[PDB]
Amino acid sequence: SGALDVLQMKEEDVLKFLAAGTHLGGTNLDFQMEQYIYKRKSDGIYIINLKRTWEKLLLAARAIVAIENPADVSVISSRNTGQRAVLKFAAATGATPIAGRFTPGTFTNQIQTAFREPRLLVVTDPRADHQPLTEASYVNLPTIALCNTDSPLRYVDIAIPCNNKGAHSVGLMWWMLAREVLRMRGTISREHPWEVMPDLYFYRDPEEIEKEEQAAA
Amino acid sequence: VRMNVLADALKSINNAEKRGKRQVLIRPCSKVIVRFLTVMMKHGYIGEFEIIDDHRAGKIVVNLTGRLNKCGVISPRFDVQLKDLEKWQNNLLPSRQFGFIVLTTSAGIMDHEEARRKHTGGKILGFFF
Amino acid sequence: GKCRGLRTARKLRSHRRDQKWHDKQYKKAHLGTALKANPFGGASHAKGIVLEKVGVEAKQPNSAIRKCVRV
Amino acid sequence: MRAKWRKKRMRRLKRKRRKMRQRSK
Amino acid sequence: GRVRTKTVKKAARVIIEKYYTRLGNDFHTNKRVCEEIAIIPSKKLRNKIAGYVTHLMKRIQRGPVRGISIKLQEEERERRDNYVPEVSALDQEIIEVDPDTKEMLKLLDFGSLSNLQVTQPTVGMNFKTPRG
Amino acid sequence: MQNDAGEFVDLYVPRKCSASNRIIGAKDHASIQMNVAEVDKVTGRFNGQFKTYAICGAIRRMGESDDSILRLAKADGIVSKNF
Amino acid sequence: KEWLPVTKLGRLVKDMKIKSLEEIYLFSLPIKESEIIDFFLGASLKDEVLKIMPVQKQTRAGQRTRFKAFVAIGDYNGHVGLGVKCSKEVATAIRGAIILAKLSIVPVRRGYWGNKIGKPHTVPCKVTGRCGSVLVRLIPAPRGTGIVSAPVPKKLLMMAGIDDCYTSARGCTATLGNFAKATFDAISKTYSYLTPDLWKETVFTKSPYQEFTDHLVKTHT
Amino acid sequence: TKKRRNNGRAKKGRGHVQPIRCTNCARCVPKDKAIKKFVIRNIVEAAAVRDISEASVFDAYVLPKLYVKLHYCVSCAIHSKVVRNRSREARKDRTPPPRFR
RNA sequence: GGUUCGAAGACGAUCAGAUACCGUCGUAGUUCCGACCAUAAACGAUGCCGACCGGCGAUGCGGCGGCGUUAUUCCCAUGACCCGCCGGGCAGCUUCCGGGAAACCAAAGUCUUUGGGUUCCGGGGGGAGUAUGGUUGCAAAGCUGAAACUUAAAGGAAUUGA
Ligand SMILES: [Zn+2]
């Protein structure tokens, strides 16, 4: 988010991100989300400032790198939209994801065998994962939440304004976050882009999978 | 009715300190309030302030700092003697290590400790710690 | 009181003086009719003449019949 | 027995007292 | 009302999770395997447990089972949970530029270099859907 | 917290947040020392030193934590001033 | 009898890497282990049973007379605690009271009275903690005075170490369930107070999990 | 204690409303205190429309409807068994039951 | 002036026992004029004035600006929309602002860290708003207002057995 003069952007990915749908906001508005508004669009649409989302993403990635151990990173997901996205993000990072079914008793209570302690937590949606927002107050755990203009800001540590309705808008932000964490850690050189069609990383509907299988075979 | 404006100003900055505000805006430009701000500036409980002076009661912007618990008002203003000052500071101030009782004299506005050395009483203004 | 007045000494003094009459514990000890009905009238000890003895029942379950003396 | 009936019985009793005072005076 | 009981459900998942290798779709195969590995007192309870084991095997052959933790499905999940990609997305030379961020990045160390191009402002009318 | 000799008689010192200028209580379970890893300007990798922050429970239960961290980073010189 | 480290900080206690128990209070980490306090402070950690309160919840099968044990814990010059555990049998009630008393321990704040010499003895400033109808106004006292209060908070202040304090009760203080929480909150809100002496900022350091995060993940699972 | 947040009626800052007599009994009920009902219904029940469509002079005669605004008090509404006691969290909901069929 | 309704009262059963539930009647009242008194749950079971302390959708008034519209279609701006902003007035939803024993309140918060101005009123419960004192009234009734005697209780909130 500061003291770098390497990453720089020019023009072209407007035509990709308009088709992706990351600029799309919610219908209503929270009063704490008034500073993240860039512009408006017809019939109840906010335009989320993607290059301020870039700066919040850089601050969150600094938090991810400051959590030096990659094993104790909790990636919490709630809905069926963000399952394959956090699965491929756990493939890129090397951590333990939670794709739904939060169990009260694993972290709060000391009876069950699954008693872990990951420091960093990533919340997909506050209104959906309202229950993992509770243990951030009882236990000293930082929180990187993904929020909309309709979503409020309560018992959160840092928030990133993104669309959490479209599967393209979810998988796009995870697919962009996975490069930033790996380049700020540093394993692979800063040389090449990605060639393969991005249909692998987004969440796919089973009717779409059957339609693509019928079109292929 | 707004008879004691200084009481409402102390209540407003007290609620501002309870919420945790960084700055405060008040309406009058009373010289007693300005001298009380310059008294608190020498102790260093709040930051430096500024005024916007119209051709009326000019507005005051005070940049507050988190170095104050509560500054209550004394209404009505009673006289303070040298012999009774111990009984004032016993129930008015919480502790003996910290605590200030501002009061005006015929010479000028000063704290309670300098008036003990100068041996000259006066009417009480307020208390802050 | 509720009024934080400056020249309001005698008003709150009269209010406290009327509160002294409205108080029950102070008023009962300083009655003339109660002191007239009091057989002592400030006395500690008193003599008397025994004329008869009357038995008095007791109250609920813990019962007895105790003999008082009409003096 | 209600407070209204107690007030009514005391109203009748005070009316009887006023009648006795009117016969006495 | 042939409902498989909790004494069957606590046993059968542990039996499959331990001896997942020595199993089969046939009833007479794992009916004799349960006789070896487990001690079942009665034939009716043995047949109920073996039928529920064959039903769980049919559930495995259809798809993934939420309750049991199969080692093979755990390895299949671990492959797509630790498959590190070669080259991921971001650092191409040409990504988006926003005009209101162009003003705020000029102050600190994100200055206006030669590799920048401001875009046209996006069209928009009104940000409230009618309330009905 | 001195004595007649001059040594600090207290044995531990509590924390104080720099954003809201308020102290941090003892049993404040929402208090987080947020660390930020320092990044080189020409390499873009991990260096070894960190930058610390302070988060108290009052700012979190009020609902201004992501703004307070933003203002602290803006005052330290990471996040730009205008935003 | 042998303790097993459940939490991750328990492995640091078992390996003797954290040396100070006040470093837990500095990072404000939640203590969910009972044997760590008994390991460090074993002989000094004393128990005092204040009062057993029987309560009878009424069911269709008569009533279940369950007990509520109040157990104060701690050395006479140091840390104190307050554990509240209600159970139906006295052995489990006393055991749970001792466990919750070992979990919930608080430090008390000693202060000076005007003149600065020697060790602090009194309450530094006028603080209080109110809940229910109990309000104990903690007022400082000169040296060699005592605790002018009820004998149970006098015993709690003897356990605390503050030998000199004047109190001022208000309201119905007979309610012990609100009285124990009030005298717990009054000594808990002593350090949580802005003072003019505390103007210098507190220096920070690395988290103890971040310091040994490479060793704790490899020494066990 | 005070059971409801309001006083069981829609009187906000007026003081007096128009009294409306009840339908079942002769209780003098206020307007906002009354439980009001509006039920529409055809005059035929099961087969009268079929009998008229079989035997008539006119062809495709339209049927009228019933329009009676019913009023009930607290006792009469429960005696006609319309309203029902709900949970304390459901008492705060001023929403009607859903109109599906 | 008295149509309807309908205290007192009659009749019919009702009931071991009804000038109680219910119906048919039915006097005074029910409506106004010229007057008398001050009584209601005149309840919001909540003293008045001035200020600080979150957000949201909308209704009723006035003013203001503007894509697309209807009416006069035909210039012209207001009636009817929609999108906004402010003030006064009435509400609601959410809420670790704040407090209480809880119901819950942007006030019932700005109380122990107790003092913004500010009139009236209650001191365990009954007797009892009773005697007595005068005042106003044709009458009904309203005002201030005790005492002897008895009483370890009388109460508020919020849960079980049925
Ligand atoms: Zn009715």
Residue numbers in the entry:
A (entry chain BB): 2 to 218
B (entry chain XX): 2 to 130
C (entry chain YY): 2 to 72
D (entry chain n): 1 to 25
E (entry chain SS): 2 to 133
F (entry chain WW): 1 to 83
G (entry chain DD): 58 to 278
H (entry chain bb): 2 to 102
Q: Anything the authors wrote about it?
A:
Type IV IRES sequences, including the Cricket Paralysis Virus IRES (CrPV-IRES) and the Taura Syndrome Virus IRES (TSV-IRES) do not require initiation factors and are the best studied IRESs. A modular architecture of three pseudoknots (PKI, PKII and PKIII) is crucial for these IRESs to establish a balance between structural flexibility and rigidity, essential for interaction with the ribosome and with two elongation factors (eEF2 and eEF1A) required for IRES translocation through the ribosome. Type IV IRESs require two translocation events to place the first aminoacyl-tRNA in the P site making use of the intrinsic dynamic elements of the ribosome involved in canonical translocation. We report the visualization by means of single-particle electron cryo-microscopy (cryoEM) of two related states of the mammalian ribosome with a double translocated CrPV-IRES and P site aminoacyl-tRNA at 3.2 and 4.75 Ångstroms resolution.
Slow movements of the CrPV-IRES compared with canonical translocation of tRNAs are evident from this data and explain the capturing of a late-stage intermediate of translocation with eEF2 in our dataset. Our cryoEM reconstruction reveals that the conformation of the IRES in this intermediate state is similar to the conformation reported for the single translocated state, with the SL-IV and SL-V detached from the 40S and exposed to the solvent. PKI is in an intermediate position between the P and E sites of the small subunit as well as the aminoacyl-tRNA is in an intermediate position between the A and P site of the 40S. Domain IV of eEF2 occupies the A site of the small ribosomal subunit. This configuration is maintained by a distinctive swiveled configuration of the 40S head, resembling one of the late stages recently reported for the first translocation event. At this stage, CrPV-IRES translocation should be coupled with the movement of the aminoacyl-tRNA occupying the A site, and this seems to happen with a conformation of the IRES similar to the one reported for the first translocation. This conformation is maintained until the very last moment as the intermediate captured here with eEF2 presents a back-rotated configuration of the 40S. However, a pronounced swiveling of the 40S head is in place, probably induced by the presence of eEF2.
